[PDB]
Amino acid sequence: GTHSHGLFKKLGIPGPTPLPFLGNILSYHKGFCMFDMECHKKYGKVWGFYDGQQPVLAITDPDMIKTVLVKECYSVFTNRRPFGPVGFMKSAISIAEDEEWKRLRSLLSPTFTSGKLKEMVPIIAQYGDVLVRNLRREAETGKPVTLKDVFGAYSMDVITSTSFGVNIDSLNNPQDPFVENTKKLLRFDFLDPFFLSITVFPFLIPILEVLNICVFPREVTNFLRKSVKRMKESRLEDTQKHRVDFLQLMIDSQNSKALSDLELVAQSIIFIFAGYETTSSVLSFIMYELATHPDVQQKLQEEIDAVLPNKAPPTYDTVLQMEYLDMVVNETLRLFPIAMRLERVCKKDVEINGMFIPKGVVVMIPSYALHRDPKYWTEPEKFLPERFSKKNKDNIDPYIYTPFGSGPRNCIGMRFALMNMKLALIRVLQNFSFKPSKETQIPLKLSLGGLLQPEKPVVLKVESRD
Amino acid sequence: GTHSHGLFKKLGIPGPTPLPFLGNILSYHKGFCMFDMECHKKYGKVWGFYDGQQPVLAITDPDMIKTVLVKECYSVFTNRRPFGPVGFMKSAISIAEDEEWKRLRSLLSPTFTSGKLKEMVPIIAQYGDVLVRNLRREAETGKPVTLKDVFGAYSMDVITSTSFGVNIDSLNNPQDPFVENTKKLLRFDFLDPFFLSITVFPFLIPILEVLNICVFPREVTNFLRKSVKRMKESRLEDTQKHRVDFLQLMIDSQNSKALSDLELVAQSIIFIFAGYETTSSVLSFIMYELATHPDVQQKLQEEIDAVLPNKAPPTYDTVLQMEYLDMVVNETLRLFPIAMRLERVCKKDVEINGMFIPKGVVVMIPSYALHRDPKYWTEPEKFLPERFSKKNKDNIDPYIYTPFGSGPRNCIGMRFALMNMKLALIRVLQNFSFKPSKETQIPLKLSLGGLLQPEKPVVLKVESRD
Numbered sequence: 001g002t003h004s005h006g007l008f009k010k011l012g013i014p015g016p017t018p019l020p021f022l023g024n025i026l027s028y029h030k031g032f033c034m035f036d037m038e039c040h041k042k043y044g045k046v047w048g049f050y051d052g053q054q055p056v057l058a059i060t061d062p063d064m065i066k067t068v069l070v071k072e073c074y075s076v077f078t079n080r081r082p083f084g085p086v087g088f089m090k091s092a093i094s095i096a097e098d099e100e101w102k103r104l105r106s107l108l109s110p111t112f113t114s115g116k117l118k119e120m121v122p123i124i125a126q127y128g129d130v131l132v133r134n135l136r137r138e139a140e141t142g143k144p145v146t147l148k149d150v151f152g153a154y155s156m157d158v159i160t161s162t163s164f165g166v167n168i169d170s171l172n173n174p175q176d177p178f179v180e181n182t183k184k185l186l187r188f189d190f191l192d193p194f195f196l197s198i199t200v201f202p203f204l205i206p207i208l209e210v211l212n213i214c215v216f217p218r219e220v221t222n223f224l225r226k227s228v229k230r231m232k233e234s235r236l237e238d239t240q241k242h243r244v245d246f247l248q249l250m251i252d253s254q255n256s257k258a259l260s261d262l263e264l265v266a267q268s269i270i271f272i273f274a275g276y277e278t279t280s281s282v283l284s285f286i287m288y289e290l291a292t293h294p295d296v297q298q299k300l301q302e303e304i305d306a307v308l309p310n311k312a313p314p315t316y317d318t319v320l321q322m323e324y325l326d327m328v329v330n331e332t333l334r335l336f337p338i339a340m341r342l343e344r345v346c347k348k349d350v351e352i353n354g355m356f357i358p359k360g361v362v363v364m365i366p367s368y369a370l371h372r373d374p375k376y377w378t379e380p381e382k383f384l385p386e387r388f389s390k391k392n393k394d395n396i397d398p399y400i401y402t403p404f405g406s407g408p409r410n411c412i413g414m415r416f417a418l419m420n421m422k423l424a425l426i427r428v429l430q431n432f433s434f435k436p437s438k439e440t441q442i443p444l445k446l447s448l449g450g451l452l453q454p455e456k457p458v459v460l461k462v463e464s465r466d
Numbered sequence: 467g468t469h470s471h472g473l474f475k476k477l478g479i480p481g482p483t484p485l486p487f488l489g490n491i492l493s494y495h496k497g498f499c500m501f502d503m504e505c506h507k508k509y510g511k512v513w514g515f516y517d518g519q520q521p522v523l524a525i526t527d528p529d530m531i532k533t534v535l536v537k538e539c540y541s542v543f544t545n546r547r548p549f550g551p552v553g554f555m556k557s558a559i560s561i562a563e564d565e566e567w568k569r570l571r572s573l574l575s576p577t578f579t580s581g582k583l584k585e586m587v588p589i590i591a592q593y594g595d596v597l598v599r600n601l602r603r604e605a606e607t608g609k610p611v612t613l614k615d616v617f618g619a620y621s622m623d624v625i626t627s628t629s630f631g632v633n634i635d636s637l638n639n640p641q642d643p644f645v646e647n648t649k650k651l652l653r654f655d656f657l658d659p660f661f662l663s664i665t666v667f668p669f670l671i672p673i674l675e676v677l678n679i680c681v682f683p684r685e686v687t688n689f690l691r692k693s694v695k696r697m698k699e700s701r702l703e704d705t706q707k708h709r710v711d712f713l714q715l716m717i718d719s720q721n722s723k724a725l726s727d728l729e730l731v732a733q734s735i736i737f738i739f740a741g742y743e744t745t746s747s748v749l750s751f752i753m754y755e756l757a758t759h760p761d762v763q764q765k766l767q768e769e770i771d772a773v774l775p776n777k778a779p780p781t782y783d784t785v786l787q788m789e790y791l792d793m794v795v796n797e798t799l800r801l802f803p804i805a806m807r808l809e810r811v812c813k814k815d816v817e818i819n820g821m822f823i824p825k826g827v828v829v830m831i832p833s834y835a836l837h838r839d840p841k842y843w844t845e846p847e848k849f850l851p852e853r854f855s856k857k858n859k860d861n862i863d864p865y866i867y868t869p870f871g872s873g874p875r876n877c878i879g880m881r882f883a884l885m886n887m888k889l890a891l892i893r894v895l896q897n898f899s900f901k902p903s904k905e906t907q908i909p910l911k912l913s914l915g916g917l918l919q920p921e922k923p924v925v926l927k928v929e930s931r932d
């Protein structure tokens with residue numbers, strides 16, 4: 001009920017006083033972000049709370065964050081928190097621990113190099129054209145557009161083609177059984193009744209595992225495992241067809257300790273899970289900010305037209321030339337860091353930067369609250385891309401601004417996700433301008449659940465530049 | 467039900483084919499020893515079986531045993547199998563794991579040196595006199611004597627005085643609340659219904675832990691924790707009284723990483739648990755063999771009388787002079803190695819002595835079966851102390867004969883237990899001879915439960931040498 005609930009009291013660390021059994025989870029009734037913001041305001045640089053009986057130590061000092069994410073990653077702070085019955089997906093790189101994670105990160109690191117990304121760009125660009133065509137249908141119909149739907153389909157299109165060479169126009173083919181399954185790989189809501197109950201009753205997770213109950217949908221993981229099996233068998237029957245998708249990269253990495261067959265499928269699944277809703281969410285937030293800041297949208301369209309005259313198709317190198325595009329993406333990720341928090345489990349008693357941290361504590365970095373901390377950001381609630389201009393970006397501490405984490409366990413898809421989103425943004429802004437409609441919620445309100453998402457879906461009027 | 471049950475089949479390792487859920491536990495219906503003997507006979511040098519879903523790999527090659535117990539102890543084979551809800555007794559040295567065990571073994575190793583034992587010998591010897599007095603009461607009454615009762619009291623007397631300076635004649639004071647509690651610290655029967663159920667349902671152990679259900683009796687551990695607290699407070703109130711018990715040694719080791727207060731109590735309890743029933747059991751087996759081999763008993767009495775003329779009291783150095791006494795003890799421990807098995811969990815995939823062993827497998831050394839293996843022992847079912855004579859003992863492989871284990875995690879009480887038993891044996895044989903009575907079971911039969919013990923308690927006629 002309370003065994004660990006005296007820990008922060010004994011260490012002299014402030015925080016909200018926990019209830020028996022629940023710890024502090026009733027404080028999540030307005031979501032993770034308001035809880036972290038309010039704790040930061042009332043307790044200062046460090047504080048502790050309890051997710052059930054699990055102690056969590058929040059840290060905000062940039063030097064201490066670097067020690068945790070970078071300096072002592074391999075020695076002390078190697079793994080994330082365990083989160084529920086996970087089955088074979090225990091082998092997914094984001095879930096793996098210690099030397100198993102370190103191996104998978106080695107096997108998969110070459111897959112995400114800029115050189116491999118550059119070869120994927122033509123595939124990603126194809127679906128920006130598909131996005132533009134589908135957008136244009138809804139633009140000369142005058143209907144306001146639900147961004148999560150069109151960017152959801154775009155995100156899914158890019159995934160299926162860059163992961164498996166499966167080429168689908170998912171918006172217009174929603175009944176395709178491939179899309180029907182992958183679309184179920186949505187982010188977990190850790191404030192939903194199931195995950196709250198597992199937080200209060202963590203002793204039930206082994207029971208769920210022994211019964212093969214998994215938080216990833218069994219029908220979907222069964223479908224995808226079967227599919228990758230058949231795909232790998234087909235690529236054996238046609239070795240002349242030279243492919244550049246993530247499956248082929250992992251197939252090639254299986255020969256000259258290497259990836260097992262089930263480890264391969266776990267990564268295929270986690271890449272869909274990692275990229276699907278995140279990409280569409282960020283794209284939706286970005287378009288919301290551009291619609292509500294027309295001067296920014298116009299400046300960005302001017303940059304795109306200067307780099308790519310007359311709707312010239314974007315390329316790897318021309319994307320990297322667009323400074324203001326980078327600033328807009330980075331400033332939206334500052335406001336809306338969809339991970340909300342970074343976490344590492346402390347593997348052993350340590351003293352870092354003068355503070356003792358016991359073995360077993362989860363150390364948490366509250367990215368959302370730090371992204372909006374007025375000690376580090378002038379007017380942090382405002383959308384101001386110039387924060388990230390060449391004459392201002394030196395003021396930005398890389399352990400305060402952490403939308404993709406930091407250190408050896410940072411986001412391995414970061415370069416891909418940025419290139420993916422920028423290519424979409426370029427193609428859509430070459431062709432359309434986005435404006436608020438009657439049904440647009442302004443100012444945007446955030447959901448009170450466990451996911452960083454708008455309270456109501458973002459809807460925008462879409463107009464052809466022609 | 468069966469997830470791991472294909473492991474030994476896939477590795478090409480022979481063994482009894484497991485049933486769903488149960489594994490091979492129905493094969494324990496005649497105890498651990500007959501199972502290990504029969505497996506060794508039918509499968510050869512290595513075999514595998516399943517305790518529920520837990521794979522166990524039995525090894526018999528002396529080189530491989532050395533690698534496991536000695537060479538790769540710290541790297542790969544550091545811990546024993548987990549066995550049930552254990553509460554704070556997780557800190558007992560026999561239960562601790564990895565660096566926590568390595569620390570406790572360092573803190574407690576100086577406590578068991580020959581120098582500290584030599585200072586304890588006068589205390590142990592006092593209770594050999596008490597044993598002789600109590601024996602003499604039952605000898606001039608002509609009643610056959612139940613060995614577990616008189617050696618149980620002796621074992622308990624030595625424990626209370628060498629552990630805590632508590633001086634009790636436990637045979638004649640059974641209602642003393644100290645004795646009433648410590649006497650409940652009997653060995654676990656891992657074939658009893660509770661431990662079989664936990665073997666089949668290991669996913670229930672976390673539920674028991676969260677409810678503070680412990681396999682060590684709570685009333686007893688509560689009593690002893692309270693007692694050690696009051697004892698430590700008294701020794702503070704009388705620092706001139708200089709003590710040589712295990713409590714004082716651990717108190718002194720607390721000052722010039724060191725032992726915590728709760729770690730101290732856990733060791734006090736585990737030392738009673740480790741020494742109480744083991745010592746009395748071995749003493750009973752030894753006296754059974756001496757009663758049924760009068761020529762051995764006479765030869766031993768002749769050696770004792772030569773080293774200690776006219777019932778001279780034994781001392782540390784004169785005990786170590788008695789070669790035949792050592793041979794008798796060692797040969798009884800060969801027949802009756804009360805641990806039955808040694809076990810280590812494999813922490814990582816390794817290849818030792820040409821064999822691949824996966825992470826998570828329990829490697830087991832079947833001491834009982836190896837002690838009775840005719841490849842290593844002429845007529846292994848016979849009691850033959852001369853096996854251990856100076857002209858024969860070189861034939862004895864120290865990884866086949868393992869009554870106290872081997873390597874860094876061997877029995878830390880070995881020297882104490884041997885000195886304890888030898889001092890008792892000397893004092894009793896100086897005063898009495900032991901003979902079979904009408905109610906003595908000859909040949910001795912072993913129990914079919916989970917503990918190496920006689921089927922019926924050993925009873926012997928006891929006669930004064932006068």
Ligand code: HEM
Pocket residue numbers: 069093094095105270271274275278279282338339342343402403404405406407408409410411412413414416417418
């Ligand atoms: C805008 C899109 C994305 C954002 C904001 C994002 C953000 C993050 C963050 C904050 C982390 C935690 C890093 C840490 O704990 O230090 C993470 C980890 C990770 N991300 Fe992303 N991510 C995005 C897209 C993707 C994509 C598209 C992929 C794969 C194709 C991906 C794969 C991963 C993986 C595998 C990890 C765990 C890495 C490890 O444990 O070694 N992410 N991401």
Ligand code: HEM
Pocket residue numbers: 535559560561571736737740741744745748804805808809868869870871872873874875876877878879880882883884
């Ligand atoms: C005839 C009496 C005894 C016998 C036959 C015996 C036998 C054993 C055996 C076979 C082991 C396992 C070693 C291994 O796994 O390699 C062991 C471990 C151990 N024994 Fe004994 N024992 C006896 C008495 C005692 C006594 C009297 C004490 C304490 C006062 C004691 C304390 C321990 C401890 C603490 C361990 C675990 C050591 C560790 O994990 O570091 N034993 N014993």
